[PDB]
């Protein structure tokens, strides 16, 4: 609703990850452009680009989302508007999750300070 | 509701973290016992203990939640019931979050595959 009409840029090296995020934002009325790479996100973020936000995966080979953001910010300064850039951390989350299960934990608590989530994590009682 | 009446054990080295989680579970009717340490979680998890679940912080000095879980599982096998053990990953999440902000990202997307969360992360439009 509120992000209806806006143009997001979704950067991830993983096609399934792109597909999920872009379908979610497509649902909310955003129109979405993807990019498989930091190098390509910078190509698409040039001097006059018209993007309203950007969902940037932090774990990519060759150039990770942290560098491609340092670059986007320096791109913007040498061109002087703040492109809001939000990190997609599912790569890190999945890795700690395997690390949990692997020492015999029965799962993890997403959003670890939100009540409804601590409930949702405990259905070893039904 | 569903976890009303059950006895959780909340293991964390951080008093504020303990206070939050235990107050959330206290709200839901659980009665809660804490522990500041892996060593103390194992003391409280002995041969006949009566706990129904356990929220285990993965980052503690001296003995981290991963080891104290390997120990709890070996404690249980040498005593042979599966104590459901859920990991609290806020230590890792906070660290990647600083790592995001520090290269000039405007935030991160919690629960990176849930739609309502990708919306909630974008209020650079209001
Ligand atoms: Ca990735
Ligand atoms: Ca901790």
Q: Report the CATH number at residue B7.
A: 3.40.50.2300
A8 and A63 share a domain? yes
Nearest residue to A25 via CA among A88, A77, A102: A88
B17, B28: one domain: yes
Contact, B117 vs B111, CB < 8 A?
yes
| CB B124, CB B106: distance < 8 Å | yes
Computed from CA positions of residues A61, A55, B105, A49, in that sequence, does the dihedral angle turn out positive or negative?
A: positive
Same domain? For B20 and B72 the reply is yes
Assess whether A51 and A99 both reside in one domain.
no
Whether residues A57 and A107 share a domain: the answer is: no
Q: In angstroms, what is the span from residue B113 Cα to ligand 1's centroid?
A: 13
Helix (H, G, I), strand (E, B) or coil at B1: coil
* Minimum-distance CB partner of B103 among A28, A66, A110: A66
Complete edge-to-edge strand list for the sheet that includes strand B7-11: B31-35, B7-11, B53-57, B85-88
| Structure token pair of residue B92 | 């890792």
Let me know whether A66 and A119 are in one domain.
no
Sheet architecture: strand order including A53-57:
A31-35, A7-11, A53-57, A85-88
Chain A residues with CB under 8 Å of B87 CB are 96, 100, 105, 107-109
Q: If phi over 0 gives left and psi between -120 and 50 gives alpha, with beta otherwise, what is residue B62?
A: left
One DSSP character per residue, chain A reads: -TTTT-EEEEE-S-HHHHHHHHHHHHHTT-EEEEESSHHHHHHTT-SS----EEEEES--SSS-HHHHHHHHHHHHHTT-----EEEE-HHHHHHHHHHHHHTT---B-SSTT-HHHHHHT--S--
Domain that holds residue B32: 1-88
Resolution limit, Å: 2.5
The verdict on A21 and A79 lying in the same domain is yes
Q: Are residues B109 and B122 in the same domain?
A: yes
Cβ pairs bridging A and B (under 8 Å): 156
For B16, which residue in chain A has the nearest alpha carbon?
A113
Cβ-Cβ contacts under 8 Å for B13 (sequence gap 6 or more)? B36, B37, B57, B59, B60, B61
- The domain tally of chain B equals 2
The answer to whether the CB of B37 falls within 8 A of the CB of B28 is no
Same-domain pairing of A118 and A96: yes
Instruction: Say how many Å lie between the CA of residue B33 and the centre of ligand 2.
Output: 17
């Amino acid at each position: 609703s509120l992000l209806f009409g806006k143009k997001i840029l979704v950067v991830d090296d993983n096609v399934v990850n792109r597909r999920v995020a872009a379908g979610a934002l497509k649902n909310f009325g955003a129109d979405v452009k993807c990019a498989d790479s930091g190098k390509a996100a910078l190509e698409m973020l040039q001097f006059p680009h018209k993007f309203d936000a950007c969902f940037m995966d932090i774990q990519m080979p060759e150039m990770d989302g942290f560098e491609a953001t340092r670059r986007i910010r320096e791109m913007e300064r040498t061109a002087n508007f703040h492109l809001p850039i939000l990190a997609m951390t599912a790569d890190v989350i999945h890795a700690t999750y395997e690390e949990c299960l692997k020492c015999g934990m029965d799962g993890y608590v997403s959003k670890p300070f939100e009540e409804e989530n601590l409930y949702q994590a405990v259905a070893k009682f039904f």
